[PDB]
Amino acid sequence: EYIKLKVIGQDSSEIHFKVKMTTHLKKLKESYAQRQGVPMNSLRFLFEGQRIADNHTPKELGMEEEDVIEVYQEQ
């Protein structure tokens, strides 16, 4: 199963990702950073305010269709 996730940037822009429930979200982080032209390690990705790990899957985080991921600068 795939779901569509909405990634909201620091500037309120959006990129949506169709991601398999078993795919490690590292792959989404890499794609987003590539498209923003910044290093992946300059960013932190949050779901419901909690940090998304490289090896988190959407299934592990209980994500559903049209759930939101927020991107902030790394601290």
Binding site: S13, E14, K18, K20, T23, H24, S31
Partner: peptide, 12 residues
């Protein structure tokens, strides 16, 4: 901005 949907492949 237009809608942007990226398909993430299953290969890692």
């Amino acid at each position: 901005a237009e809608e942007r949907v990226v398909v993430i492949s299953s290969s890692e």
